[PDB]
Amino acid sequence: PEPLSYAAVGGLDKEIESLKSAIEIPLHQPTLFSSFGVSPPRGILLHGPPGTGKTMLLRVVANTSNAHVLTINGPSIVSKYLGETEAALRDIFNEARKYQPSIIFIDEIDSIAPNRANDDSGEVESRVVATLLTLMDGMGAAGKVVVIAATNRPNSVDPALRRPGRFDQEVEIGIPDVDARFDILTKQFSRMSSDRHVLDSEAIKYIASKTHGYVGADLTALCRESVMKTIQRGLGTDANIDKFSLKVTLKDVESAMVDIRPSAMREIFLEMPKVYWSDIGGQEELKTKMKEMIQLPLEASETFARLGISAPKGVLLYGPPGCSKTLTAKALATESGINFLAVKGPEIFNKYVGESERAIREIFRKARSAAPSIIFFDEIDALSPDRDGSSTSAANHVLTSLLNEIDGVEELKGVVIVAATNRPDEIDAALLRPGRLDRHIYVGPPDVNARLEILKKCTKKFNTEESGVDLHELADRTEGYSGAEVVLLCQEAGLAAIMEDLDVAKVELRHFEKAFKGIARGITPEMLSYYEEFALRSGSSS
């Protein structure tokens, strides 16, 4: 029995500190809030997607805090009929009250008081929510009691429990980021002695990098699976190997990766990978314009206010498919340092009725929470009201929610909305009017310098100068290819290289010639003329 400690928790140090404060300020000294004449906040609710580390945090709070732990075991104290159940829970609260200081732990409130939905059994669920409200109505500002709550989904909890003055302090324990994933991995692999874990910190970098979707508990599972497969490699050599100290290795960790893949973020707003400005080929004009028109307003708020001008509220990127738009937004995300929440088009539109408006609401709330922030909307084309009557019940509602959140700049100061599209017309004109998503930047097919840069980025691994191919004739021969077609031309050239030989280490011009014959232009002059005719009708930066 090793008692847990805050060193065991990982990747949540920010909200670890927040929860520690929300426990220490009450439960150790309510006199402070007695002086300031507000009822002390009784009730901290730990949100979070499943497996993020709630229950572990509750256990570590119980172990670390010197107060007395009490538990509402959900069903495990509710009796057959509620007449004894309500008495039992009141008895729990009273026993906490007599032995102040005390903490009441409620796990899985969704399994206790979800009375908003249809599953509210008036004999059971309504009674439980009623008694929760009734006793939560008072424990005494002088009382040294606190209620802590953990739910895998908050909105399932009825709004009645989440009214203010009830348990309403909130700690949003969320999906770990890349650095948080590294923290969790380092702690987990330090739980085992470093002898058996032969992975240098660079290996942990790598495994954290390839564990995008994984959340919390999942990572421990990964480590556990690694153990198993390591043991299996001990048996794969010969069954007679009963010797211990078989090291766990990086290769074992991917071999585990391929098989664990449990429930984690695949229906959550995407955190995109890391790309720098160097990866993007040229387009220095667009790079400068984006750097300015996004990063500068978020880092010049005092200067903008001094000048009597509101900051730009929204920039819309439009260009032929393949040209660097998602990559440019990702690069801005990676090396602008601003919090950057991105959502694909369809992944928010589908979001069956109500879930769409809720999703827009929560994305904007999160954007406001961690200001300054950039909300990236890839393919606004999805959120288009330009369809038949079926769109009136889905597209119109989401469009008007987006409009209502976009406007009202008084509450929007550290938020910039960057949208991307390849079908600019089908973006409802109510969203490209002045005062709204109004700056329009046209990406367009890359110019010759940018194309040459893309070549040099993608042709570097296979010999070019000492293979007799000069990239400039390729660059001026590939006029009109969108950047995707340029990188595909490089890929097809490599495919010809492996065509002619399995272990070749050299790429000739004839391979590029075959590739260039094989690839067809994807940007017809129709599409170009389309984009300038949208440029004339545009609002800003035509």
Ligand X SMILES: [C][C][C]S(=O)(=O)N1N=[C]C2=C([C]=C([C])S2)[B@@]1([O])O[C]1[C]([O])[C]([C]OP([O])(=O)OP([O])(=O)OP([O])([O])=S)O[C]1N1[C]=NC2=C1N=[C]N=C2[N]
* Binding-site sequence positions: 48-55, 319-326
- Does the N-terminal peptide bond of residue 446 adopt cis geometry, omega within 30 degrees of 0? no
* 319 binding partner (options ligand AGS, a copy of itself, ligand X, none; Cβ < 5 to 8 Å by kind): ligand X
In angstroms, what is the minimal distance from the CB of 476 to a copy of itself? 21
- The binder of ligand X chosen from 175, 264, 327, 493 (CB under 6 A): 327
In angstroms, what is the minimal distance from the CB of 35 to ligand X? 39
Q: Which stretch binds a copy of itself (CB under 8 A): 33-41, 98-106, 332-340, 467-475?
A: 33-41
Which string of b and e fits 320-345 if b means at least 16 CB within 10 Å? Answer: bebbbbbbbbbbbbbebebbbbbbbb
Q: For 437, what's the count of Cα atoms within 13 Å in the CB-facing half-sphere?
A: 28
- The enclosing H or E element of 264 equals none
In angstroms, what is the minimal distance from the CB of 322 to ligand X? 4
Contact, 423 vs 297, CB < 8 A? Answer: no
* 541 binding partner (options ligand X, a copy of itself, ligand AGS, none; Cβ < 5 to 8 Å by kind): a copy of itself
DSSP state of 78: -
- The binder of ligand X chosen from 207, 420, 452, 507 (CB under 6 A): 420
Contact, 430 vs 399, CB < 8 A? Answer: yes
Q: What residue is closest to ligand X based on CB?
A: 483
422 is a site residue for ligand X (CB under 6 A): yes
Binding site for ATP: which residues? 48-55, 319-326
In angstroms, what is the minimal distance from the CB of 397 to ligand AGS? 27
Q: Which of 152, 114, 132, 176 is nearest to 43 (CA)?
A: 132
Q: Which stretch binds a copy of itself (CB under 8 A): 155-163, 174-182, 331-339, 465-473?
A: 155-163
- The binder of a copy of itself chosen from 6, 277, 304, 530 (CB under 8 A): 304
Look at the alpha carbons of 483, 487, 488, 493 in this order and tell me if their dihedral is positive or negative: positive
Residue 203: helix, strand or coil by DSSP? helix
540 is a site residue for ligand X (CB under 6 A): no
* 292 binding partner (options a copy of itself, ligand AGS, ligand X, none; Cβ < 5 to 8 Å by kind): a copy of itself
The angle formed by the CA atoms of residues 102, 104 and 109, to the nearest 5 degrees, is: 170
DSSP state of 310: P
Say how far residue 264 (Cα) sits from the centre of its chain.
11
Site for ligand X in 260-319 (CB under 6 A): 275, 279-281, 310, 319
- The binder of a copy of itself chosen from 178, 203, 338, 371 (CB under 8 A): 371
* 454 binding partner (options ligand AGS, a copy of itself, ligand X, none; Cβ < 5 to 8 Å by kind): ligand X
Contact, 30 vs 144, CB < 8 A? Answer: yes
In angstroms, what is the minimal distance from the CB of 252 to a copy of itself? 12
* 326 binding partner (options ligand X, ligand AGS, a copy of itself, none; Cβ < 5 to 8 Å by kind): ligand X
* 327 binding partner (options ligand AGS, ligand X, a copy of itself, none; Cβ < 5 to 8 Å by kind): ligand X
203 is a site residue for a copy of itself (CB under 8 A): no
In angstroms, what is the minimal distance from the CB of 6 to a copy of itself? 16
Cα–Cα distance, 268 to 51 (Å, whole number): 14
Question: Which own/partner contact pairs does 266-272 have at CB distance under 8 Å and 24+ positions apart?
Answer: 266/213, 267/347, 268/49, 268/175, 269/341, 269/342, 269/343, 269/363, 270/342, 270/343, 270/344, 270/347, 271/175, 271/177, 271/212, 271/342, 272/330, 272/333, 272/340, 272/342
* 184 binding partner (options ligand AGS, ligand X, a copy of itself, none; Cβ < 5 to 8 Å by kind): ligand AGS
By rule CB under 6 A, what string of x and - marks binding of each residue 446-485 to ligand X? x-------x----------------------------xx-
Scanning the structure block, which residue is given the tokens 């090793």?
Answer: 2
- The enclosing H or E element of 161 equals none
Structure tokens at 328: 């440019």
Q: Which stretch binds ligand X (CB under 6 A): 10-18, 79-87, 486-494, 511-519?
A: 486-494
Cα–Cα distance, 356 to 476 (Å, whole number): 46
Taking only Cα atoms into account, the Rg of the chain, rounded to an integer number of angstroms, comes to: 29
Q: Which stretch binds a copy of itself (CB under 8 A): 27-35, 92-100, 143-151, 276-284?
A: 27-35
Interface with ligand X by CB under 6 A: which residues? 275, 279-281, 310, 319, 321-327, 378-379, 409, 420, 422, 434-435, 446, 454, 483-484, 487-488, 491
